[PDB]
Amino acid sequence: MFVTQVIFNMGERAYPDRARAMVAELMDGVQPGLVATLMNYIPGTSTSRTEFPTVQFGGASDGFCLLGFGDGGGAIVRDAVPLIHAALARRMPDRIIQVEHKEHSLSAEARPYVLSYTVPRMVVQKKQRHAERLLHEAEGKAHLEGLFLRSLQRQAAAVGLPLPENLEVEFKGAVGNFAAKHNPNSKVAYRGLRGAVFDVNARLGGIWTAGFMLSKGYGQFNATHQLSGAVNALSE
DNA sequence: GCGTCTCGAATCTGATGCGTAACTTGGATGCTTCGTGCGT
């Protein structure tokens, strides 16, 4: 029902993957339970869970942000943020780290017409053949709409939010593509989409997640702020 | 088409007098006979 978003103001835009790597690195050894809980690890092992992650990372314009889902997510972010703040203060002795703590109510109500919803970061590259299928809407709609529907239903079930039984979505398109890597020296990269616009006949309150593999910082979007239509101020 | 943070706090939180007076303060009755005269 409640989503907690915490932003650490480091002063520079850090990509979410390196952010998660470094926050893992800072908490090595001290308070192992916090590390296991924050990294989405099975108790007793360091492996991650295939299930939807309750721990969330995102790329803030001024830094990186922690997102908790549900009471468990809220509780973990609440007892976690002082520790990561202390670690960041320890590592960066000559910079002030600022913490912004804001909560979003999560609500999804139906609506007999559609609204323009978009995201900056979709994980859509599965096969190279499907990548060229985006020229025709009909061929590429099936897997994209299926991905959106499954992502929405699984995140709703994870957060326990009621959703209508009659959601239909049609895709519009994206702005461009981008490449992302595990490490700067890694030779493995994936393709995402920026401005992937799709129309849904329902309202989405608060911040929302779509796609899969979200903990590394993909598929987060504030649907509520997008409805304000502040995307007009994009020019040079 | 909701946006969110903030979404108070401390302290006082009754004092003082006045907080009865005067007067009434019981009274009365509870038996028959006898003589003389009316009296209907």
A106: the nucleotide nearest its CA (via C1') is B2
- Residue A152 has which token pair? 């929405």
- The vertex-A48 CA angle with A124 and A28, nearest 5°, equals 120
Q: What is the CA A92 to C1' B30 distance in angstroms?
A: 124
The angstrom resolution of this structure is 3.2
Of A211, A210, A209, A207, nearest in space to A224 by CA: A207
Q: How far is CA A33 from the centre of its chain?
A: 23
Could you tell me which residues come within 8 angstroms of residue A54 by beta carbon, excluding any fewer than 6 positions away? A40, A68, A69, A70, A72, A73, A76, A158
φ, ψ (nearest 5 deg) of residue A46: -95, 5
CA→C1' distance for A102 and B8 (Å): 20
* CA–C1' gap, A227 and B23, in angstroms: 94
Nucleotides of B under 7 A from a protein CB: 1-6
H or E segment to which residue A223 belongs: helix A223-227
Distance between the alpha carbon (CA) of A190 and the C1' atom of B32, Å? 148
Distance from residue A75 (CA) to nucleotide B10 (C1'), in Å?
A: 33
Q: How was this entry determined? A: cryo-EM
Residue A184: both structure tokens together: 């700067």
Helix A70-91 vs helix A16-26: angle between axes, to the nearest 10 degrees? 80
User: Using an 8 Å Cβ cutoff, are A40 and A91 in contact?
Assistant: no
**Residues engaging strand B (CB under 7 angstroms):** A 101-105, 107, 111, 115, 203, 205-206, 224-225, 227-229
Please name the residue whose C-alpha is nearest to the C1' of nucleotide B3: A225
Contact indicator for A70, A155 with CB cutoff of 8 Å? no
Distance CA A150, CA A212 (A): 9
